[PDB]
Amino acid sequence: CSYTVSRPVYSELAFQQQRERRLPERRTLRDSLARSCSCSRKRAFGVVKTLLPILDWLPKYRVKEWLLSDIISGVSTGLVGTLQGMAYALLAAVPVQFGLYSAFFPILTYFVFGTSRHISVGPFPVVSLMVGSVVLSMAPDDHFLVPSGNGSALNSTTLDTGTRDAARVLLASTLTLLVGIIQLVFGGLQIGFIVRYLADPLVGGFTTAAAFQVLVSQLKIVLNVSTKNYNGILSIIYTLIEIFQNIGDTNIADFIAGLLTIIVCMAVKELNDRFKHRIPVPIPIEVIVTIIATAISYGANLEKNYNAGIVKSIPSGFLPPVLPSVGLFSDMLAASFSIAVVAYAIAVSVGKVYATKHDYVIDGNQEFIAFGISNVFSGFFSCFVATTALSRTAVQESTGGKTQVAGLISAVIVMVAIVALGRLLEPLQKSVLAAVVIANLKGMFMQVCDVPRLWKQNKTDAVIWVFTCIMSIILGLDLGLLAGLLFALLTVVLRVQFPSWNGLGSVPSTDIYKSITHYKNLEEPEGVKILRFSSPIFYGNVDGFKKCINSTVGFDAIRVYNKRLKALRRIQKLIKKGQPKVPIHSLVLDCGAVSFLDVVGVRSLRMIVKEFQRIDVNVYFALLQDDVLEKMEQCGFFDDNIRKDRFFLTVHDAILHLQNQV
Amino acid sequence: CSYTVSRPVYSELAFQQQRERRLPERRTLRDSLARSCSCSRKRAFGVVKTLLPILDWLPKYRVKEWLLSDIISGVSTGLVGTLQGMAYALLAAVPVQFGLYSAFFPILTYFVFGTSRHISVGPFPVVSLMVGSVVLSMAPDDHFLVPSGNGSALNSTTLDTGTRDAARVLLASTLTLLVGIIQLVFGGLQIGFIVRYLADPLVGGFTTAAAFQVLVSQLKIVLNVSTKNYNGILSIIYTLIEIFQNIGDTNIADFIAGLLTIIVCMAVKELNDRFKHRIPVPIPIEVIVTIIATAISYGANLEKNYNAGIVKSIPSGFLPPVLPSVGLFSDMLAASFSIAVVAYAIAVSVGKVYATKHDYVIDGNQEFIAFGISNVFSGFFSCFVATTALSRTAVQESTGGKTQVAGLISAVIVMVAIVALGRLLEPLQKSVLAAVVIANLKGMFMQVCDVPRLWKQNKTDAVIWVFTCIMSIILGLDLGLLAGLLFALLTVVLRVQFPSWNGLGSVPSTDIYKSITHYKNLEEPEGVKILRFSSPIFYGNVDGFKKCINSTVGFDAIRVYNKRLKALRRIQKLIKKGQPKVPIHSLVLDCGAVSFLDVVGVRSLRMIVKEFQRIDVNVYFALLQDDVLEKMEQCGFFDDNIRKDRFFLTVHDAILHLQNQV
């Protein structure tokens, strides 16, 4: 249906002379500093509810498909966490006793504080390596080096034990407490908007790349290949080439056992994925392969008779809480900070990926303070940092899992294993439990299948994804996320710097203006051209805007002006001796899609206006709605002759003005 | 004048069903790779003209106010360059003979290649310190250490001379040639758009701290204070505190002479600025103070009788061109690259500041290749890097100066001084020539008077300026520009992330839509609200867009939906036992100012559309002109029920549709 909107042509000064403005409220803080929460108890109840993210999902869960699913998922992820703790405790240069504590207590203190499902809090490989490195740096390997033991030639300088591991555990506990209090003080000032910068392609490249890292770190142990420690740049490539070079000393029995286990478990997993409708409850093959491996190992003695590799070092009993050493908290403060940061990073990553599979968008500051207080509670008990492994969350999400109660039942399993079931999982071959992680890693390995779809949608995000992936693979997960974030910001500033500028034109007998490079049968006003940059004119796209203008108008104002003055001097000297301009009347810049301007932008705009006025060709504008016009008039854009009359509300009004002017 | 534009309401599908598109030209390279310059000689002539920036201003200069002005400016800047060379050659751990060569030959080879006025090519303090550092690292201080000279107790291990300085000069020449060829290969691939990122506030904050740095580096020599070398972080502050701590061993005569000279020269400078109309030619007080200082020094013997400090080390005679050592070019390649980069940076800085005083905007790639070939020509002659000092360009621009011929006459003065006028400027006290730079530094010291103006114009550029200034002062000019560029990109992404969102509304009996938070006496459609985000919906402002929506509509869709389903379950269980929604009908997002979208953006937009559809409240759109709509339909935004009918061309069309629908 048509509509009659007959309205006189309204410029800027012709529109404000009859309307009225609104007095802007400065909102000074000297009297409004107590307007957040003075006496209203509703906001207090709300912030108390949001501070404790346990009364949200626990009073709302449904026990229909909950109990057995979360129980089996928790048992699986608890087995995985026990394996990871027994590995990382030895990797962290500390005695292998506190991995179970770091899998038990942080999970407990996170079950009450923290709203992020499908996350198993515990030790992470790269952060454990960083902890071990910063511990070895501030602690000599030989504390006393007792020279006794009647050696061969000189005094037997045996490495001192007992006190060495005790000091190492004390330093690790102090470091974890420092990282926790630093996470808490970071969550204090509410710096949580950083999560707004982690895009889905960014977290993908990252997760896939990590997947690959945890894949190779499980392959190096499923083959029993003695590899050196590598971190920083080229870490993954160096570990891979070291594995490929030292493939000789490989346990054949352990290798074939791991291969059989990964094959049978991926087969039963794809079978369950195919027959998910017949069998109601997903069969937990994790516990099945675990118990059959323990049975075939205890009944054959795969260690003392075949050298396959088993745990054989399960401790027992808890330890009382010990107070840390405050006098050292300064030294760790020099480095732990950085570690702490990347820790949180890894945390949100193992969330953000799953934010793409389930509508469970989380908040940054809440998870920040949750991980902070969780690592604080990890302190005083000689635990590890409150990170979260990728393999554990993978095995928790792939094998069912609905809420965080899976972590709770995993902690219960770890507790019963450390108090009464230690001798049960003694002959575990460390292979099927290192193969279930590779099995459930398929959910993240298949994430590379979206790159063909991402490229066919927007080549920007696909390039970002592949760049993040390769740069992480090269520079290690520590710097990979930072490099990917910098590249994403660079792509954003490039897309805001290089827009899709096109010349606009009206449709016949109407006032709709569309691009002429994509449509046909349009018409262009004789002597009046339209240009829509569709981008903020900041200090970057200034020369780009000039190039767009001089390419859309056909000519360049500088060259035609200098040629005109040269010809004027020529004809003047010829009279003293004796005797490429386009018919375009004006141009209307459709700079309506601009969101912000700077001082350089308005200066360049004034320079362009003056330069075009010097060629006797006017330059008009378009809908500077509310803020760009105020910022222009505030920066001294109107001084002596340039007024707001040259601007217009709509492009059709400018076209009609240029029409009725001639 | 009114206008009748009666037109039926046009949505997206209602506008493309009668018009036609244009076949997009893919422009494959396999057949268009020879379309740049195949046989047309016009483009060849143009690129030859642009490659040699000497046929532009030289056949165009006007000798009216040119000859004497550029002559005196060149003599002044040549004196300054001789002083800077005699200083930096000693600072670069090389014998003090080649500073005059680095001031003479690079200027010669830049006079023909390079279009950037008010720039004196030569040695720069920080790049000279970097050269000295990278030379001392790859060259031992004691080459042979001849143990002869019948010392006190052991053999007199005198430092080897002759070959030491020769090897140092050879290494410096090889380093300069390597930096030059690296600059050339950088200019090769035409990576010159980096100059598009250096804003005017950025270069101001860079040049004010550089002005303070050259001020303190001239103050440390005008007082004869033995200070240690400092580079990197806290360099300026450390040098300043070292000066303030070692102020004791200060030459009183030299101090009072420098003070008198700076006072009288600033007085005569402000007098000439006041009496510029009376005296046509600006009186070159530089040569006057120089000759009177040489007279009062040669007639009083200020060195051997007063210890004031003079040059007394002016060499004589040129040196034949010597071939470098190629077998070392690899080693310098590890570091020189970085240096080279920052060199170019400093270069463009001493241009960009003056780009604010004169309309002489330059191009990045041309200056890049010019400095490259200039430093290449500096090679084979044992010269320094082709940088440009701030004090030299300051004294060249403040004391007249029109074109680059000032550099040419400065080089001529340096040549005549090194061949025949060496004994003339022997007793120069190194004070008045170190005070003229502080005098002409006022032109850049007064550039801090824009902070209130920039603050009153736009709050962002002033914060950028002050941040760049303080960060440069803290971290040294090497990292200051990089930190300022990163902060500028961060401010850009923040301004594009946090827009000025406002609810829109129409004016009575018209179709103009303006913000309701700034105007009054407007009207809002009963049940229909307008929202204009005025920003690209990328992965950063997604949650910001959600917050804007739920704050403009008053409610939040998630909470009202969960409360509605809870109440539905409640009434259902009550029937089994026995028995805050705003009247807003729909919202029209005026997302017309969007310039680019990503996959996360379109995913979040689809999620918002579905969520609002679940609350029986429709959501409409606005002018997605040409590219955002195509990118949305390419990312799978329309699958089963969401069609392009919900979109509209103008906001008034959407309002009329919502009106006639009910």
PDB file of N, CA, C and O in Angstrom, chain A residues 1 3 7 9 20-22 196-197 456-457 488 494 497-498 516 518 521 532 534 539 543 593 595 625-626 634 653, chain B residues 1-3 6-7 9 20 22 196-197 456-457 488 494 497-498 516 518 521 532 534 539 543 593 595 625-626 634 653:
ATOM      1  N   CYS A   1       0.826  -1.203   0.000  1.00  0.00           N
ATOM      2  CA  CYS A   1       0.000   0.000   0.000  1.00  0.00           C
ATOM      3  C   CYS A   1       0.863   1.257   0.000  1.00  0.00           C
ATOM      4  O   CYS A   1       1.830   1.357   0.755  1.00  0.00           O
ATOM      5  N   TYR A   3       1.754   5.409   0.406  1.00  0.00           N
ATOM      6  CA  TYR A   3       1.642   6.310   1.543  1.00  0.00           C
ATOM      7  C   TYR A   3       2.074   7.707   1.126  1.00  0.00           C
ATOM      8  O   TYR A   3       3.044   7.868   0.382  1.00  0.00           O
ATOM      9  N   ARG A   7       6.494  16.183   2.474  1.00  0.00           N
ATOM     10  CA  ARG A   7       7.196  16.910   3.514  1.00  0.00           C
ATOM     11  C   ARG A   7       8.181  17.873   2.868  1.00  0.00           C
ATOM     12  O   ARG A   7       8.874  17.498   1.910  1.00  0.00           O
ATOM     13  N   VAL A   9      11.563  19.863   2.122  1.00  0.00           N
ATOM     14  CA  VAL A   9      12.947  19.417   2.226  1.00  0.00           C
ATOM     15  C   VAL A   9      13.556  19.971   3.507  1.00  0.00           C
ATOM     16  O   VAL A   9      13.550  21.185   3.744  1.00  0.00           O
ATOM     17  N   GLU A  20      12.718  20.941  19.414  1.00  0.00           N
ATOM     18  CA  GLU A  20      13.463  21.287  20.614  1.00  0.00           C
ATOM     19  C   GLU A  20      14.286  20.087  21.058  1.00  0.00           C
ATOM     20  O   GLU A  20      13.939  18.937  20.778  1.00  0.00           O
ATOM     21  N   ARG A  21      15.385  20.371  21.750  1.00  0.00           N
ATOM     22  CA  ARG A  21      16.279  19.337  22.239  1.00  0.00           C
ATOM     23  C   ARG A  21      15.907  18.949  23.669  1.00  0.00           C
ATOM     24  O   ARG A  21      14.929  19.435  24.242  1.00  0.00           O
ATOM     25  N   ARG A  22      16.702  18.057  24.252  1.00  0.00           N
ATOM     26  CA  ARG A  22      16.541  17.634  25.636  1.00  0.00           C
ATOM     27  C   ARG A  22      17.836  17.908  26.386  1.00  0.00           C
ATOM     28  O   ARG A  22      18.921  17.581  25.894  1.00  0.00           O
ATOM     29  N   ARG A 196      34.321 -11.482  25.894  1.00  0.00           N
ATOM     30  CA  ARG A 196      33.600 -10.966  24.738  1.00  0.00           C
ATOM     31  C   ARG A 196      34.462 -10.948  23.484  1.00  0.00           C
ATOM     32  O   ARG A 196      33.925 -10.804  22.381  1.00  0.00           O
ATOM     33  N   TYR A 197      35.778 -11.091  23.628  1.00  0.00           N
ATOM     34  CA  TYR A 197      36.689 -11.050  22.493  1.00  0.00           C
ATOM     35  C   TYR A 197      37.016 -12.427  21.931  1.00  0.00           C
ATOM     36  O   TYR A 197      37.627 -12.509  20.861  1.00  0.00           O
ATOM     37  N   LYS A 456      32.464 -20.986   2.700  1.00  0.00           N
ATOM     38  CA  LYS A 456      31.362 -20.740   1.779  1.00  0.00           C
ATOM     39  C   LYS A 456      30.355 -19.755   2.359  1.00  0.00           C
ATOM     40  O   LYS A 456      29.366 -19.415   1.701  1.00  0.00           O
ATOM     41  N   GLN A 457      30.592 -19.291   3.586  1.00  0.00           N
ATOM     42  CA  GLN A 457      29.718 -18.320   4.235  1.00  0.00           C
ATOM     43  C   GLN A 457      30.412 -16.967   4.345  1.00  0.00           C
ATOM     44  O   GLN A 457      29.874 -15.959   3.882  1.00  0.00           O
ATOM     45  N   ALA A 488      42.460 -11.523  15.295  1.00  0.00           N
ATOM     46  CA  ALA A 488      41.035 -11.228  15.194  1.00  0.00           C
ATOM     47  C   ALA A 488      40.777  -9.730  15.295  1.00  0.00           C
ATOM     48  O   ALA A 488      39.966  -9.181  14.538  1.00  0.00           O
ATOM     49  N   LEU A 494      40.559  -4.163  10.012  1.00  0.00           N
ATOM     50  CA  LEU A 494      40.663  -4.148   8.557  1.00  0.00           C
ATOM     51  C   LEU A 494      39.288  -4.107   7.906  1.00  0.00           C
ATOM     52  O   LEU A 494      39.079  -3.377   6.929  1.00  0.00           O
ATOM     53  N   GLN A 497      38.117  -0.765   8.243  1.00  0.00           N
ATOM     54  CA  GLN A 497      38.937   0.176   7.490  1.00  0.00           C
ATOM     55  C   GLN A 497      38.673   0.105   5.990  1.00  0.00           C
ATOM     56  O   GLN A 497      38.665   1.139   5.315  1.00  0.00           O
ATOM     57  N   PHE A 498      38.464  -1.100   5.454  1.00  0.00           N
ATOM     58  CA  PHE A 498      38.210  -1.311   4.031  1.00  0.00           C
ATOM     59  C   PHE A 498      36.768  -1.756   3.838  1.00  0.00           C
ATOM     60  O   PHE A 498      36.475  -2.960   3.864  1.00  0.00           O
ATOM     61  N   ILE A 516      24.434   0.801  -7.741  1.00  0.00           N
ATOM     62  CA  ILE A 516      24.342   0.658  -9.192  1.00  0.00           C
ATOM     63  C   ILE A 516      25.280  -0.406  -9.739  1.00  0.00           C
ATOM     64  O   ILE A 516      25.113  -0.830 -10.893  1.00  0.00           O
ATOM     65  N   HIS A 518      25.440  -3.436  -8.611  1.00  0.00           N
ATOM     66  CA  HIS A 518      24.776  -4.724  -8.464  1.00  0.00           C
ATOM     67  C   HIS A 518      23.426  -4.796  -9.157  1.00  0.00           C
ATOM     68  O   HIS A 518      22.980  -5.895  -9.493  1.00  0.00           O
ATOM     69  N   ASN A 521      19.046  -1.241 -14.944  1.00  0.00           N
ATOM     70  CA  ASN A 521      17.867  -0.460 -15.315  1.00  0.00           C
ATOM     71  C   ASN A 521      17.615   0.707 -14.366  1.00  0.00           C
ATOM     72  O   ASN A 521      16.483   1.188 -14.256  1.00  0.00           O
ATOM     73  N   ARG A 532      28.385   6.234  -1.028  1.00  0.00           N
ATOM     74  CA  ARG A 532      28.148   5.730   0.322  1.00  0.00           C
ATOM     75  C   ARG A 532      29.353   4.898   0.738  1.00  0.00           C
ATOM     76  O   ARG A 532      29.563   3.797   0.220  1.00  0.00           O
ATOM     77  N   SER A 534      29.962   3.714   3.867  1.00  0.00           N
ATOM     78  CA  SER A 534      29.495   2.659   4.770  1.00  0.00           C
ATOM     79  C   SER A 534      30.607   2.197   5.712  1.00  0.00           C
ATOM     80  O   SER A 534      30.881   1.004   5.850  1.00  0.00           O
ATOM     81  N   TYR A 539      41.197   7.665  11.365  1.00  0.00           N
ATOM     82  CA  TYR A 539      42.531   8.003  10.878  1.00  0.00           C
ATOM     83  C   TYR A 539      43.106   6.971   9.916  1.00  0.00           C
ATOM     84  O   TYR A 539      44.163   7.226   9.330  1.00  0.00           O
ATOM     85  N   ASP A 543      42.809   8.276   3.716  1.00  0.00           N
ATOM     86  CA  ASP A 543      43.292   8.165   2.345  1.00  0.00           C
ATOM     87  C   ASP A 543      42.455   7.180   1.543  1.00  0.00           C
ATOM     88  O   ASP A 543      42.278   7.361   0.335  1.00  0.00           O
ATOM     89  N   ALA A 593      26.045   5.483   7.338  1.00  0.00           N
ATOM     90  CA  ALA A 593      26.431   4.293   8.084  1.00  0.00           C
ATOM     91  C   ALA A 593      27.639   4.524   8.982  1.00  0.00           C
ATOM     92  O   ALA A 593      28.204   3.555   9.500  1.00  0.00           O
ATOM     93  N   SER A 595      29.613   5.416  12.331  1.00  0.00           N
ATOM     94  CA  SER A 595      29.323   5.255  13.750  1.00  0.00           C
ATOM     95  C   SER A 595      30.178   6.126  14.654  1.00  0.00           C
ATOM     96  O   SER A 595      29.721   6.496  15.737  1.00  0.00           O
ATOM     97  N   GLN A 625      22.932  11.232  11.975  1.00  0.00           N
ATOM     98  CA  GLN A 625      21.729  11.161  12.797  1.00  0.00           C
ATOM     99  C   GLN A 625      21.803  11.954  14.099  1.00  0.00           C
ATOM    100  O   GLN A 625      21.119  12.972  14.243  1.00  0.00           O
ATOM    101  N   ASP A 626      22.620  11.514  15.045  1.00  0.00           N
ATOM    102  CA  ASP A 626      22.551  12.147  16.359  1.00  0.00           C
ATOM    103  C   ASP A 626      23.904  12.549  16.924  1.00  0.00           C
ATOM    104  O   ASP A 626      24.011  13.610  17.544  1.00  0.00           O
ATOM    105  N   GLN A 634      31.440  20.020  17.129  1.00  0.00           N
ATOM    106  CA  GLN A 634      32.261  20.265  18.308  1.00  0.00           C
ATOM    107  C   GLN A 634      33.734  20.420  17.954  1.00  0.00           C
ATOM    108  O   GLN A 634      34.460  21.142  18.646  1.00  0.00           O
ATOM    109  N   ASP A 653      16.068  14.048  -0.229  1.00  0.00           N
ATOM    110  CA  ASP A 653      15.970  15.487  -0.011  1.00  0.00           C
ATOM    111  C   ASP A 653      17.135  16.221  -0.660  1.00  0.00           C
ATOM    112  O   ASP A 653      16.950  17.282  -1.267  1.00  0.00           O
TER     113      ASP A 653
ATOM    114  N   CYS B   1      10.258  22.635  -0.045  1.00  0.00           N
ATOM    115  CA  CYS B   1       9.259  22.166  -0.999  1.00  0.00           C
ATOM    116  C   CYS B   1       8.919  20.700  -0.760  1.00  0.00           C
ATOM    117  O   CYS B   1       9.808  19.855  -0.656  1.00  0.00           O
ATOM    118  N   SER B   2       7.624  20.404  -0.676  1.00  0.00           N
ATOM    119  CA  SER B   2       7.178  19.038  -0.458  1.00  0.00           C
ATOM    120  C   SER B   2       7.406  18.196  -1.713  1.00  0.00           C
ATOM    121  O   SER B   2       7.773  18.698  -2.780  1.00  0.00           O
ATOM    122  N   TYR B   3       7.182  16.891  -1.573  1.00  0.00           N
ATOM    123  CA  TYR B   3       7.378  15.963  -2.679  1.00  0.00           C
ATOM    124  C   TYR B   3       6.483  14.749  -2.486  1.00  0.00           C
ATOM    125  O   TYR B   3       6.336  14.255  -1.364  1.00  0.00           O
ATOM    126  N   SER B   6       4.683   8.705  -3.103  1.00  0.00           N
ATOM    127  CA  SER B   6       3.763   7.607  -2.827  1.00  0.00           C
ATOM    128  C   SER B   6       4.248   6.320  -3.477  1.00  0.00           C
ATOM    129  O   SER B   6       4.335   6.224  -4.705  1.00  0.00           O
ATOM    130  N   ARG B   7       4.563   5.332  -2.642  1.00  0.00           N
ATOM    131  CA  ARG B   7       5.172   4.086  -3.069  1.00  0.00           C
ATOM    132  C   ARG B   7       4.636   2.949  -2.211  1.00  0.00           C
ATOM    133  O   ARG B   7       4.536   3.095  -0.984  1.00  0.00           O
ATOM    134  N   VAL B   9       4.539  -0.354   0.043  1.00  0.00           N
ATOM    135  CA  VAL B   9       5.506  -0.841   1.021  1.00  0.00           C
ATOM    136  C   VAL B   9       6.341  -1.946   0.392  1.00  0.00           C
ATOM    137  O   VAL B   9       5.809  -2.956  -0.088  1.00  0.00           O
ATOM    138  N   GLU B  20      16.117  -6.391 -11.513  1.00  0.00           N
ATOM    139  CA  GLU B  20      17.069  -7.407 -11.930  1.00  0.00           C
ATOM    140  C   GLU B  20      18.441  -7.069 -11.368  1.00  0.00           C
ATOM    141  O   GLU B  20      18.751  -5.910 -11.081  1.00  0.00           O
ATOM    142  N   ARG B  22      22.886  -7.723 -11.438  1.00  0.00           N
ATOM    143  CA  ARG B  22      23.989  -7.667 -12.386  1.00  0.00           C
ATOM    144  C   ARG B  22      24.937  -8.823 -12.104  1.00  0.00           C
ATOM    145  O   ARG B  22      25.293  -9.069 -10.947  1.00  0.00           O
ATOM    146  N   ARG B 196      49.215   4.549   7.026  1.00  0.00           N
ATOM    147  CA  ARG B 196      47.802   4.850   7.206  1.00  0.00           C
ATOM    148  C   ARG B 196      47.356   4.674   8.650  1.00  0.00           C
ATOM    149  O   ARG B 196      46.273   5.144   9.014  1.00  0.00           O
ATOM    150  N   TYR B 197      48.163   4.011   9.478  1.00  0.00           N
ATOM    151  CA  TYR B 197      47.809   3.747  10.865  1.00  0.00           C
ATOM    152  C   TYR B 197      48.378   4.768  11.840  1.00  0.00           C
ATOM    153  O   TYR B 197      47.976   4.773  13.008  1.00  0.00           O
ATOM    154  N   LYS B 456      38.394  18.944  24.505  1.00  0.00           N
ATOM    155  CA  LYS B 456      37.125  19.614  24.242  1.00  0.00           C
ATOM    156  C   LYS B 456      36.526  19.237  22.902  1.00  0.00           C
ATOM    157  O   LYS B 456      35.314  19.418  22.723  1.00  0.00           O
ATOM    158  N   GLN B 457      37.313  18.725  21.956  1.00  0.00           N
ATOM    159  CA  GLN B 457      36.788  18.299  20.663  1.00  0.00           C
ATOM    160  C   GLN B 457      36.278  16.866  20.701  1.00  0.00           C
ATOM    161  O   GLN B 457      35.114  16.624  20.364  1.00  0.00           O
ATOM    162  N   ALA B 488      45.936   2.642  19.860  1.00  0.00           N
ATOM    163  CA  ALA B 488      45.033   3.265  18.899  1.00  0.00           C
ATOM    164  C   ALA B 488      44.114   2.231  18.262  1.00  0.00           C
ATOM    165  O   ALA B 488      42.912   2.474  18.103  1.00  0.00           O
ATOM    166  N   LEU B 494      37.266  -0.551  20.326  1.00  0.00           N
ATOM    167  CA  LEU B 494      36.334  -0.235  21.403  1.00  0.00           C
ATOM    168  C   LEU B 494      35.230   0.696  20.921  1.00  0.00           C
ATOM    169  O   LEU B 494      34.058   0.507  21.267  1.00  0.00           O
ATOM    170  N   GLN B 497      32.976  -1.300  19.047  1.00  0.00           N
ATOM    171  CA  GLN B 497      32.321  -2.301  19.879  1.00  0.00           C
ATOM    172  C   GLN B 497      31.225  -1.705  20.753  1.00  0.00           C
ATOM    173  O   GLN B 497      30.165  -2.318  20.919  1.00  0.00           O
ATOM    174  N   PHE B 498      31.461  -0.521  21.321  1.00  0.00           N
ATOM    175  CA  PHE B 498      30.499   0.162  22.183  1.00  0.00           C
ATOM    176  C   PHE B 498      29.957   1.386  21.455  1.00  0.00           C
ATOM    177  O   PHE B 498      30.534   2.479  21.554  1.00  0.00           O
ATOM    178  N   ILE B 516      15.004   9.593  20.526  1.00  0.00           N
ATOM    179  CA  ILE B 516      14.066  10.135  21.504  1.00  0.00           C
ATOM    180  C   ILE B 516      14.746  10.574  22.791  1.00  0.00           C
ATOM    181  O   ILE B 516      14.124  11.282  23.598  1.00  0.00           O
ATOM    182  N   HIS B 518      17.361  12.544  22.867  1.00  0.00           N
ATOM    183  CA  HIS B 518      17.901  13.878  22.642  1.00  0.00           C
ATOM    184  C   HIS B 518      16.846  14.893  22.228  1.00  0.00           C
ATOM    185  O   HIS B 518      17.073  16.098  22.376  1.00  0.00           O
ATOM    186  N   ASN B 521       8.825  16.129  22.449  1.00  0.00           N
ATOM    187  CA  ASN B 521       7.573  16.296  21.713  1.00  0.00           C
ATOM    188  C   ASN B 521       7.415  15.276  20.589  1.00  0.00           C
ATOM    189  O   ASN B 521       6.649  15.500  19.647  1.00  0.00           O
ATOM    190  N   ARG B 532      18.180   1.323  17.118  1.00  0.00           N
ATOM    191  CA  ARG B 532      19.261   1.500  16.154  1.00  0.00           C
ATOM    192  C   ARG B 532      20.585   1.334  16.887  1.00  0.00           C
ATOM    193  O   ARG B 532      20.976   2.202  17.676  1.00  0.00           O
ATOM    194  N   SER B 534      23.645   1.069  15.426  1.00  0.00           N
ATOM    195  CA  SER B 534      24.638   1.916  14.761  1.00  0.00           C
ATOM    196  C   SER B 534      26.056   1.386  14.971  1.00  0.00           C
ATOM    197  O   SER B 534      26.965   2.117  15.368  1.00  0.00           O
ATOM    198  N   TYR B 539      31.668 -10.408  16.713  1.00  0.00           N
ATOM    199  CA  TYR B 539      31.761 -11.316  17.852  1.00  0.00           C
ATOM    200  C   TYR B 539      31.983 -10.604  19.180  1.00  0.00           C
ATOM    201  O   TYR B 539      31.960 -11.265  20.223  1.00  0.00           O
ATOM    202  N   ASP B 543      26.933  -9.789  22.923  1.00  0.00           N
ATOM    203  CA  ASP B 543      26.298  -9.624  24.225  1.00  0.00           C
ATOM    204  C   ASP B 543      25.936  -8.168  24.481  1.00  0.00           C
ATOM    205  O   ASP B 543      24.939  -7.889  25.152  1.00  0.00           O
ATOM    206  N   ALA B 593      23.199   1.073   9.936  1.00  0.00           N
ATOM    207  CA  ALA B 593      24.570   1.560   9.978  1.00  0.00           C
ATOM    208  C   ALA B 593      25.593   0.438  10.093  1.00  0.00           C
ATOM    209  O   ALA B 593      26.768   0.712  10.357  1.00  0.00           O
ATOM    210  N   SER B 595      28.216  -2.284   8.852  1.00  0.00           N
ATOM    211  CA  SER B 595      29.121  -2.374   7.714  1.00  0.00           C
ATOM    212  C   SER B 595      29.630  -3.780   7.443  1.00  0.00           C
ATOM    213  O   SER B 595      29.950  -4.092   6.295  1.00  0.00           O
ATOM    214  N   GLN B 625      21.383  -2.837   3.062  1.00  0.00           N
ATOM    215  CA  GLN B 625      21.385  -2.338   1.692  1.00  0.00           C
ATOM    216  C   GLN B 625      21.845  -3.352   0.648  1.00  0.00           C
ATOM    217  O   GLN B 625      21.034  -3.819  -0.160  1.00  0.00           O
ATOM    218  N   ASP B 626      23.121  -3.707   0.648  1.00  0.00           N
ATOM    219  CA  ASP B 626      23.609  -4.512  -0.467  1.00  0.00           C
ATOM    220  C   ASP B 626      24.413  -5.732  -0.047  1.00  0.00           C
ATOM    221  O   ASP B 626      24.279  -6.790  -0.665  1.00  0.00           O
ATOM    222  N   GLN B 634      23.797 -15.876   2.913  1.00  0.00           N
ATOM    223  CA  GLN B 634      24.828 -16.853   2.586  1.00  0.00           C
ATOM    224  C   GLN B 634      25.192 -17.719   3.785  1.00  0.00           C
ATOM    225  O   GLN B 634      25.582 -18.879   3.611  1.00  0.00           O
ATOM    226  N   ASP B 653       8.449   2.185   6.230  1.00  0.00           N
ATOM    227  CA  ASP B 653       7.726   1.070   5.629  1.00  0.00           C
ATOM    228  C   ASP B 653       7.414  -0.003   6.664  1.00  0.00           C
ATOM    229  O   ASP B 653       6.312  -0.562   6.676  1.00  0.00           O
TER     230      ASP B 653
END
